[PDB]
Structures are given as C-alpha cells and as structure tokens.
Design a protein around this ligand. Structure first.
Ligand SMILES: C[C@H](N)Cc1cc(O)cc(C(F)(F)F)c1
Length: 288
C-alpha cells in the first residue's frame, strides 16, 4: 500500500470460473485499479527522449533498474526503461519488466542483461505482428556490446515459441541465457486462445526453478513493457498462488504489479484474459 491502497478479491474455483466469464464485473473491477503512471517531469535528463519508445510509459523511480556500469553517477548512462518486479509472496526482483529494445537502447538492454545475471528473457508477440513492435536485439549468430559477446548457440522451434540458447562472454566470465520468443499472443483474448500462454508460463516456471537458489531476475517485454508483460507476470504469480493456497487473487496481484511499474495489464481484455488462463489452469490442476 505504498503508492495507493491495494485491493483484493480472493477467488475459489467456482467464483474464478464465473468471474472469467463476467466481462461487466471484470471491467468495473479493472477500471477501479489506479494506473500509477509516472509524471514525465520526474525525469529531467538531456538525451532521455532517445531512451523511451513512449513518452507517458516511464519507470517508477523507486523500483527502476539503474545501470551501474560504466558511470553510475551519470543519469543518462544509468537510465533504462525497466523496473524490478516482485514475485509471488512479495519476493524481491523475481522479474524485470522493460520496454522492447529500440535502435538507441539495444546496447543498454545487453548492459542490463549482464549486470543482472539475467538467465531468462520472455519476449511476447503475435505471428501477424512479426517484429514491427520490437527491434531485433539478438544476433543471427554473434554480436559484441561493451565487451560482452552474445552468441546464439541453438534455436529450438516449438508450436508457440522459439527458444534461443545464448552464451554471454566477457573476459574469463561465461554465462548461459534462455530467450523465449512467444509467437501466440492473440488478437481476440478469447478462452480458446488461453492454452499457449499457460504452456509458456509453465515452461518458464520450470526453467526458473532449474536455475537453483536465488534465481537472478527474469526479463519480460512486449513493446511498452506493461500490457502483455503484465499478463505474463500476473499469470506466473497466480499459478504459484493457486498451487500453494488453492485460491487466486488477480486483483491483488495486479495492484502489486502497478506499485512496481505503472500500467501493468493495460487493457480490460488483457485483465479478462488472465482470468481465462487462471480458470483453465484450475481445471487442469483439479485432475492431479
Ligand atoms: C521461487 C523463485 N522465485 C523461482 C520461481 C519459481 C516459479 O514457480 C516461477 C518463477 C517465475 F518467475 F518464472 F514465475 C520463479
């Protein structure tokens, strides 16, 4: 409750199924949630215009990712449109929600990946979109940014995602990276379009657990780093809540996300989609 009073609606299975199918209540509930957007006057930095894809979608100062190398004392050099996002049970820095890199921020994005020891990147797109919403920041094979060599070792093609196994090298340091390029984000967020997002969430949870204790932040991004990014993260947190508590609180999860980054889950269609995905997961989990 740091920036606004958080709200909550603890859903048991029956109510979850019904809530996902009540668009009138879903919109009433959604549009009561504060957006917690950042006033652009909060950042007064020469050259900042080049670092943001959208003037009104900025990182909340308290949770913004600060680029510590090569000049932590220079505001421009230390800037990236990215925020640390708490995970399930308030665990700090489980994710980093960021905008899709632009031509002027590709090198900054890789500086963040390296600084944060990021083991997984989740990129959310549709086939119809191709890559008109995000600049191709990874190489065809190899590219070097600020002493860090990025090498695409393997490309795994699945029905709803392309998984790239990437190596990051700098001096005597070598690190692995898994880049999940999800291609099944739907135009119409109907319940029949929920299974591929659920599969992606479950695949990423498994990959995250396999990193072992205190997994470094997982980078999630769409274009603005709030809408689809918000859906993916809220879904991942609620899957854990369902397994552990036997309930889902999408409303509280959304409020928690908005406290970390203004605008997380941007549309009511996206909000309803999280409910469709969670309703489906509850049905699948009921069989084990
Ligand atoms: C407990 C740790 N935070 C690791 C973790 C477990 C999990 O089940 C899902 C995630 C993810 F971030 F991907 F959602 C992460």
């Amino acid at each position: 409750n740091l920036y606004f009073q958080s709200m909550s609606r603890v859903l048991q299975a029956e109510e979850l199924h019904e809530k996902a199918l009540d668009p009138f209540l879903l919109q009433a509930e959604f549009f009561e949630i504060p957006m917690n957007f950042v006033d652009p006057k909060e950042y007064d930095i020469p050259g900042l215009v080049r670092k943001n894809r959208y003037k009104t979608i900025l990182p909340n100062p308290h949770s913004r990712v600060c680029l510590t190398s090569p000049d932590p004392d220079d505001p421009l050099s230390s800037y990236i449109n990215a925020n640390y996002i708490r995970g399930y049970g308030g665990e700090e820095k489980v994710y980093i929600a960021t905008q899709g890199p632009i031509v002027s921020t590709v090198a900054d994005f890789w500086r963040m990946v390296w600084q944060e020891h990021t083991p997984i990147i989740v990129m959310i797109t549709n086939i119809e979109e191709m890559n008109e919403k995000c600049t191709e920041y990874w190489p065809e094979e190899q590219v070097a940014y600020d002493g860090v060599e990025i090498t695409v070792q393997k490309v795994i093609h699945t029905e709803d995602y392309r998984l790239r196994l990437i190596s990051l090298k700098s001096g005597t340091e070598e690190r692995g990276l898994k880049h999940y390029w999800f291609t099944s984000w739907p135009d119409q967020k109907t319940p029949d379009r929920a299974p591929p997002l659920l599969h992606l969430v479950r695949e990423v949870e498994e990959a995250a657990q396999q990193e072992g204790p205190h997994c470094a932040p997982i980078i999630v991004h769409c274009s603005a780093g709030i809408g689809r990014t918000g859906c993916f993260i809220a879904t991942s947190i609620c899957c854990q809540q369902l397994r552990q508590e036997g309930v889902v609180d999408i409303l509280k999860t959304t409020c928690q996300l908005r406290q970390d980054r203004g605008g997380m889950i941007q549309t009511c269609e996206q909000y309803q989609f999280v409910h469709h995905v969670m309703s489906l997961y509850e049905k699948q989990l009921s069989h084990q």
